[PDB]
Assembly symmetry: C3
């Protein structure tokens, strides 16, 4: 009604100046990544090559920072990436909210060949190791998910470390290290054992096809 | 900041050319459906009459296709529809990812008078029968939900067939046919027994009112 | 592809004329609130001072109304606010879908200093009392959540009243008053005991910083 205006704006933007961010940062996005026009990418974000960011995803590095998404990974529709404050006001380092991967600090670290499937969320401090599938509507927060893992749909990892090569059964919310330690292993015969590689192959190809439409 | 540009684009678009999609398709949307400007609808999609598609929904038919949404159905805010690859690269048919309804093949089939309530998701291969309510934040994947069903909020159906007229209690994740077979029946006295008809009546009327604003 | 057009529109709009809404309403938003350009705010909505509304949130007051969001509260990315019909067609009051707070009627009432964290949802009829954190992916519907509460991530409150100062453990879906009555108390040592105040401080400051970018 009356169409207030026409709402003009860029969906890829710098974060705002705040008490913890004196110097604004703009996303560093590989020329081969595809960012949908209806996705949002704000602030100190690194996006790797051949990544596909789908409609309605929101990657916002304005509190905890930086947020990194490795090569050939995909951030599906409605996926949110955001993180707890990583810097104080007396100095910086709020170490409990900072994750460390290959000698570098991140608020959120999403490795290479990782699928963040539709409506999932990874909230920092968090790390997700290469070749892992984070299923539809799943949730990772204050956790480190190893490589070659599978979070089935609606699973969650909160305050834990998921060892390499394990999976979390659909609907299960893992909140203790004891339970993370006991998760089942991905084997050749497991139902999601080949899911991530298929999804990554598909999404690298969708990123290229969509790049050819812009 | 600096407003990179002004991000110009159409929210109703064709899917990209890929190895499994040599010929791009654009959505076929009944003139009486309403697509919110902040919803996204991509690729080989059929949208029926009087359907309301709300803000932030994402209907994306660029992998598995086609995605159909029957007459007088509604796709609420933040709802995602997407599907696994339905075609190979040696020919087409990836039959396990294709659902069959009234002699036609679909990646996702949403019947008539179906409510996909806010932030729910239906991921193909999947079918949802007429007059069913898919509740807020619910999830359907690799499943066939019968007609006159009710997925309460946060329920899920994965790899199963939900018989006609049953409901899934809030929060319950159904992953086996044994459990789907035992779901409770919708009766006149059940709390969500009249919910879908009310929602459909409302949403057909919202679609018309919103059409009068464009 | 072919970019149908350029999709021009306002993300802050009036609700449509319907059988239950003869007179359209436009949002009343305090000059100090920040509404992201990729959020949607429709209809009879009141937004308080210093509120931050993030990308992909959808606040839609076109069925049940009004929807109020108190001062210094935040509506994070992908959060949906919507509500069941509050008025009939023979008169108005559908009292079971109307919540009452300080002598005023609302379809959804979000108090002051409340955090609706990413991808959560509050569906009316519902009220959320001051200083409460509604966690990531959580859900509140047909419920009254007291003040100083914490809904951990993926918790839910449906058809219940959550007493003041209690929390709901991650993943738990509370559907009966008996269970709401037995929830645990927020104590100084509880893991989310200081979470809301931190989040509100942060989000008031982000709202101001983002306002300085528009
Ligand atoms: Zn956050
Ligand atoms: Zn998908
Ligand atoms: Zn609703």
């Amino acid at each position: 009604m009356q169409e207030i205006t026409v709402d003009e704006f860029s969906n890829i933007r710098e974060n705002p100046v705040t008490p913890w961010n004196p110097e604004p940062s703009a996303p560093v996005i590989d020329p081969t990544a595809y960012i949908d026009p209806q996705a949002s990418v704000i602030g100190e974000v690194t996006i790797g090559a051949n990544v596909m960011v789908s409609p309605m995803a929101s990657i916002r590095s304005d509190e905890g920072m930086p947020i990194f998404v490795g090569d050939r990974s995909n951030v599906q529709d409605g996926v949110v990436l955001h993180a707890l404050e990583t810097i104080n006001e007396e100095g910086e380092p709020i170490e409990d909210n900072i994750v460390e991967v290959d000698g570098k600090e991140y608020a959120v670290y999403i490795g290479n060949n990782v699928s963040l499937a539709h409506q999932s969320q990874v909230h920092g401090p968090a790390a997700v190791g290469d070749d892992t599938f984070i299923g539809m509507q799943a949730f990772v927060f204050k956790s480190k998910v190893g490589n070659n893992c599978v979070l089935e749909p609606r699973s969650a990892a909160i305050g834990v470390t998921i060892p390499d090569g394990r999976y979390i059964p659909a609907g299960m919310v893992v909140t203790s290290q004891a339970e993370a330690d006991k998760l089942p292993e991905v084997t050749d015969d497991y139902a999601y054992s080949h899911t991530n590689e298929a999804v990554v192959y598909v999404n690298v190809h969708l990123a290229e096809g969509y790049k050819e439409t812009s």
